[PDB]
């Protein structure tokens, strides 16, 4: 029932005020937001064309952006909620952003790195789980702090 006003991917930009089922976890909120976008939105055709994987849930913490990578995370593990309660941000806002494809700069950089290493890092042909890719998405923040320091 937690009220969260969502920044919609498309429009003045349109924002949807909901009552998130915070009892469960992020999956419930995903289903609720999907249905609300399907029904309320005047541009509901846009999102009807697009499937579920064409949008991501990013939230602004202290200015930067964080990813809700695991839907299995429970509501309490969503630090955004506690952050808002301390800041009393009711309703909170989670930016529903539209996905995008990689650019050529990134692809060339990755090929360079893979040449240096001698072995692809984006290979997913010998893994029975996403341990590796989550290791990679997690090592970022320690590296950003190390470099900033």
């Amino acid at each position: 029932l937690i009220p969260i006003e969502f920044v919609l991917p498309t429009s003045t930009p349109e924002t949807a005020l909901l009552h998130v089922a915070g009892h469960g976890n992020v999956e419930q909120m995903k289903a609720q937001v999907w249905l609300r976008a399907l029904e309320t939105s005047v541009s509901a055709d846009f999102y009807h064309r697009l499937g579920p994987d064409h949008f991501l849930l990013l939230y602004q913490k202290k200015g930067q952006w964080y990813e809700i990578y695991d839907k299995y995370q429970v509501v309490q593990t969503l630090d955004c909620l506690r952050y808002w309660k301390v800041l009393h941000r009711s309703p909170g806002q989670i930016h529903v952003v539209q996905r995008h494809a990689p650019s050529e700069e990134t692809l060339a950089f990755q090929r360079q790195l893979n040449a240096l290493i001698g072995y692809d890092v984006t290979d997913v042909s010998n893994v029975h789980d996403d341990e590796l890719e989550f290791t990679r998405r997690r090592l970022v923040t320690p590296r950003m702090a190390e470099v900033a320091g």
Binding site: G24, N25, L58, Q64, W65, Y66, E67, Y69, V74, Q76, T77, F134, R137, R138, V140, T141, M144
Partner: protein, 105 residues
Amino acid sequence: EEWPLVGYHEQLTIHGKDHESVFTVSLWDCDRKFRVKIRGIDIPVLPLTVFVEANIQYGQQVLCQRRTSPKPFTEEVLWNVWLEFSIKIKDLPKGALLNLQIYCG
């Protein structure tokens, strides 16, 4: 770089809850025994007697041991058998290794 940056036993137990408000089951409530299903093996080509042995391990430790019986040395073999472990599902440590050893004779 554009890549955006990515409980305890009291809150995650069945006891004290109605089944219709249950979503998780702590690994310690499970008093049962660990058991595995070894359906079989299939190799494109064999590069005598043969038989499996499964183990749980925690840092070169062998908490429990299990095995099976001799079998024909084909390119593919089946049991659908179950192997049950002594260690309860609440006794498992975070980091157990399920070793799977095809021996031959």
